[model samples]
Target: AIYNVEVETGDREHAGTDATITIRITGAKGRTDYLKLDKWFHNDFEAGSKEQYTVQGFDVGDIQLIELHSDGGGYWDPDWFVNRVIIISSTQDRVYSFPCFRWVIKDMVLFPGEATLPFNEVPAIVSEQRQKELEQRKLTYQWDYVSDDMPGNIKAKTHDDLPRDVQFTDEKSRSYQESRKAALVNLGIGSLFTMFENWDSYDDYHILYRNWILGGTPNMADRWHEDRWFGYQFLNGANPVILTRCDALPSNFPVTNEHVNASLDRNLDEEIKDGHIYIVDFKVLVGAKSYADIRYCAAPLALFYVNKLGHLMPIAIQINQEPGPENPIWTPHEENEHDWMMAKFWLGVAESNFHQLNTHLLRTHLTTESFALSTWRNLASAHPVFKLLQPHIYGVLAIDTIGRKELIGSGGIVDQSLSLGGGGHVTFMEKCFKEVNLQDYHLPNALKKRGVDDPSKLPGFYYRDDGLALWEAIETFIGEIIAIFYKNDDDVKRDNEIQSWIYDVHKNGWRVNPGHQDHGVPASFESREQLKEVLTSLVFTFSCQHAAVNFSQKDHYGFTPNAPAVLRHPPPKKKGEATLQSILSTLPSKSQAAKAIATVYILTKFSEDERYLGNYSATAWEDKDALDAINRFQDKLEDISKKIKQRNENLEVPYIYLLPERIPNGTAI
Candidate 1:
């Protein structure tokens, strides 16, 4: 909240002689006000008497209320009147001063550093998990079982602009028949390479489909908004960039200062400095054979992608896979457990690791304390790869528990409805606000209250302390990474080169209205105006910050740019327009809910009946809104899925392009 006062001043000759003045405030009664002679204000945190605050005997602006009792200070003008009437006065040789007031304003205009606003602040995990489960169910319905390479599931989506001629050949079969040839051998030797490359390609294609082709311009991929709101670049077939961050206890083993770039060898040092992918094998967990597998292939491959290929991928891998307590009990079979555990950790990290990598790349590889702060959704699908490491570098992760939702509200929706496989949209939603409020907000407070302000400053906070060891270890780990990659003598020199490049990008300037925390992520520019103060103070970085920024930037471009500018997401009216409820209502009572679902399955130019899916309403189909949103998601998963299908159909897939359809007015918000 803010208060403004217009004071008519007299000349210096009459400065000693007080002039009669009128004071008016924009807000209602009982609000706190500050009076200033000069504009040296940092909120009410200023200290000085009213007379001291007034400059050179000039009258300071006046307040009406005063502290007569314990409640009010002797602050306001005694001669106060209603509205704009003359509230008080002072004669010649008597200088009048304004008293600063501070009170809890219930419904005043909100500004930064004053109040916490109410809004949907839940983590995207719940809705994202639901969407994931829905997709899994969809896959189950189509295919009898699920597999890692669920081509059918992957191929079942549509979008605004489609990728130009995107195709996937079963490389394992197409590349070879029976011999152990050199090229074939190399290809067989690089499954992890293939995996990372596939992911990178998919991300690039996704961003291209949405922002470059669909949103009108090819993005520079530096805007946090871009990361928050759109998909990212992955075409370079980049490896997972690693930052061996270390945060250790002072007494236990080694360092105190957080160094986040310890893992890279001297040979690959330049790659780390440039924010490229690093093949990191987490050593925190106990697994030797798995370690060997990663060291020989996945780790080496990721390193190859980043250092050798010069592809920038900001990824973090620990020295070992740190299994949770449940792992030992959950996976009893040794061989199966190791493989399953690796897969689980890898998949989970994959979900969010992209976000971290992007954020780092965007920051030009400057380390951030909070992963959430790195990007809007932090990382796509909350990249599970990052989850393998404890100290998340980008965002605050709120576990999707029922208790968490009850404390907050429905998580802000980014693009979860797009049904883009994993829960990438949740990351998209968080970008709408600076702080996505979580239940664990008081965790820091509790520690502070317990006299543990600085984790290292306190006794029993070292790595040996059972509960705190992980945190210490994490800090040490991060510190190591920073030292190895960010803080060296040679790297500091390069910082000058990159800093200018980054500053120039900021100098070009981009703007957004980041609305209040609550209000369920203000999707409008007007609401977003509320966030101007913080946004103005924002240090803009390029590359991926998070998914929310990625998609938001895309959506903003869609509404503006060279294309026609409309407000909000235009109401859905075309195909898949019906609400899921409406779709369900049309179904007969005898028909099963599963069978009644029209949202997932579209009646394409069928084998017999329909020419095209007739008018499907977004408001009518119970799940159509979700589906539309998914297809429209910046990840462009829906488009990718569609292209896979078209590849099978032998449609005219273009070269070097994949695009989704546009957001036609009257369809799909």
Candidate 2:
């Protein structure tokens, strides 16, 4: 079902992509023939998310060239859902429903064969009840927009409008503007033009490699191309991290497609030459999804080129949604290793539980690894921080009734932050486990075996089921978290210093600039002395707290841990200097090496300026030189990456690796 349709026309390697898809149907005798393509939606439950596409018109034989609706490229559909298709007179209008896995069609068709399809319409009794319940519960329609005046007011964010704390009313922001415009100019003539948000333009084309290998007789409803899910999400996945890549990319990245082309070309060149990259170009059909496999597929190309060439920032794009150009979700802190760790954890889950996903019902929709990848995207995106870490994993969120039900529109959650409203609901802590769906997938059976089925039944993911299992997972995860946060031995020392650094900042009083996290102020501190003082005090405060392990151990779902963990005895509040000192002093720092390590940790990861100053300019840097060098280097790399991308046909003789200049001296103050 998931056939690799040949590129009939247009060059994807160049700037334009005009391709055709073809799938041959088999069973169609007395069954409905006229088929109509429908849109897909995401609901909280799989049952509620199902929609039927019936014989629209005549009892026909075969169909082709339904015109892949170029205009709806930005629709909010999953990678596997359809917005375009092959048509057999859809005037029949009979509802045809079926099951699917990954990008293959499962039971949704009536072929011309005598063999029985795997799925049958539910028994009339069950079907009748289902219809009644559907009317009552109001499931999202699969192939259409049921509501006329849907909440169009709620909009997605653009690439540029994401949150940033630092202000660049000076030269940095101005230069960023200039570079972005200029990059577009060069991309117009090169392979970079394809990555832009336009579909009609035959300028450039970029291919996506999602978790397609995960098996099932796939349908249009399962392909990433159905909604361009991979594109948009990947563009915004690792925001701060990608923004750093963006800052390092040629300025044209914003408007042109060349930045991405150049980046891919260079990376591929290296693999072709060294053969150490372990390149695997598999015509993969994933049966059991593996997040590690997907990440390795998407990330290595860019990472290899960036690290090896020392230049060539890649352009990441997700054209599945209309370019809001006004509202971006990823904020600055997303660039840090914490985001990386979280991604890694989620990736592991994707890899481990993919095959276990249920595909029979669209309600429990995460059956195929592709669908899981798509849905996991929405969850990751809700935080706004994912963009910086994995820009290559872009796509639109599949909408569903259940996901929408969780929203409290009156509050600031949707508008200010995409996170589900967890404030008051979380504060009560009355129903701690409600946040997680107990009935989803494997966990339900496991819970039932442990006698924890109903709500108000068993307490939590731990204790009720084998608490040791989760505890082990958490413990192992914490170790991974620590390593990610502290990259090297020096980094560990810096982390210790920052943990105790809180002492110096709180010496006089417990005052912190309220605007630290918010996207409000410039990162400037009147003068160099002011900057040093603030940095020193901040480092000391972190040092005092002994934050290495505590930061990750803070309370979850508003409940503190049972034992003597940081969540149990979090830092004290209300008291002035004395209380602050006590909290700081209690933070453990084994030696000066730990203190210095913490200081460096604070400098790179938790510096006040990183967030506050990152937004205003493209670089979001506080120091002028760091800002300038980052901007310049990004431009050169993007330019080079693009130029080489289009000329990547020779495998035996690969090209040379050209590195970008290091950040100039006097860049950091």
Candidate 3:
């Protein structure tokens, strides 16, 4: 039979290659030797393009699989991301589809259709190949010990240690370097190292905040100073975990019914009992060391009352955890409004510090690193669990390795901008890691623990509204995929590699002693439901949750008034202690704020080749039901994205980051 073969190149950035690819056809009747696909033009697999060729072979009844191997091209770029291949035969117009979205730096054996199979279902040819691949991967990746106290990570500690495919594109790293240079120049500053004076006006920072910020300019810059926007951020901001619905105020806040009478006409007792009251108690920031020995970080206690209009009105603010003579209550009363503003400013700086270290770094980057490392080390590429998770684990190790040198290491952006100096932040992260629980990473556990999950009670909660939807979508997708592989509870129990993976995950990711109290990580998942739930939570943490916190940085934080990383002054003892000049002076130094803006700007950007949520184009699966499930899941994501847009149309602030289309498949950046 004379076979017509068509191959597709992925549209991903720089996905084209110069490699000379050859294919070997395998069928039930007979197998063919290697046949070259390229002849005249070496650049056959150009990005986003398709190439067709013909092969005359023996009467191979039905093409079952094809082996595509590449000769290391002499050209500079040799990596190719092949989307899929199509084969047509002269006999009765028969057609075969070998779907493959794999990089051809080495070799690939692709089968018909898109749904992959379980271990028992796989042919020996595929199974043996899987085993050989795992053998290579075992050598390719190894764990490095940090300390007895610290969790282990991948041995590759630098970008150079990673494979070429895993490393950040030159464009990605260049953007970081150029952002700081342009940001420094945009602020009309000379150097980022020197401490420049405080910004004269909010307008002075506008150009830097809007024009150059990644993922476009932030809307928060405009209304960041407004009282309503200030209140909105408690639940929607980077550290939404800090906000909780309260029945009564903390004793230290000392706020009574009279303080919020203007904002809430209803009786305080009624509102409190009705669960309409909320508060941001930053007690976590207590004892959190300040940068350079300055009293920049404060564990403020701020109370809020959800009014009839659904506005989260700030009723009172106290700048310290323990009530004292110096920590006087500041209210929204007209006479001491600036005092309230002063209180808000200090809280912004503290929250900024908390979010950078706790929310963005510890929760997303570090947490992803732990799971990514453990998954790579334990799971084989052919394992159902590995296939399900590989997309979400891409490039995490590479970026995190780069991050250590640029984001949190000595003299990095964290050192320059945050309340906790570089040294202090790492120590803080380590301490916070101990206190962290695996359960809290899941939304239901976290939201209920924080008492902010009820949408009827807590109106205008865009984060919860969008996040829950994505979580369900992920759960449904992961559940369907899990059901396809595991026949029953015993199937899950019988899977030794998966059990080993979970055990490895527990030791590496959540190391807190269960003897003190359970940290909520199962040593081994007992049921398919447990695996689905855990994988759903894991996917949600790395994608939707991370995007909400990390991508929104420049928007909520670019203008320092909204969220300042470092407060230059201590909390004042008296109301009316802060004026316009004091507020400006208390903000981060010019150079410091500029550096922070640049850092988040770089971090917030979605890369050119970003593989968004619901895109399983890179998958190696070929099962009928699972592929159908994926299409249905993708349709659901589209519907969710549309619904989110419809909701954002009227929302006070559009929560764009959680839109399924906007969220990346992995924490690539």
User: Model 2 Cα displacement at 226 (Å)?
Assistant: 55
Model 2 is weakest, by summed lDDT over 10 consecutive residues, at 556-565
Q: Could you list the CA RMSD of all candidates, in the order they appear?
A: 27.0, 31.1, 3.6
Q: In model 3, state the lDDT of residue 647.
A: 88
lDDT assessment of candidate 1: 0.22
Q: lDDT per model, in order?
A: 0.22, 0.21, 0.74
Model 1 ranges with Cα > 4 A deviation: 1-242, 245-277, 280-301, 304-669
The candidate, 2 or 3, that scores higher on lDDT is: 3
Q: How big is the positional error of residue 161 in model 1, measured in Å on the Cα after superposition? A: 39
Number of the top lDDT candidate: 3
The superposed Cα distance between candidate 3 and the true structure at residue 254, in angstroms, equals 4.2
How do all the candidates rank in terms of TM-score, highest first? 3, 1, 2
The TM-scores, one per candidate, come to 0.22, 0.17, 0.88
Per-residue accuracy of model 1 over 231-263 as CA lDDT, tens digit each? 122221121122221222212221111222332
C-alpha RMSD in Å of predicted model 1 compared with the true structure: 27.0
Error of 2 at 70 (Å): 16
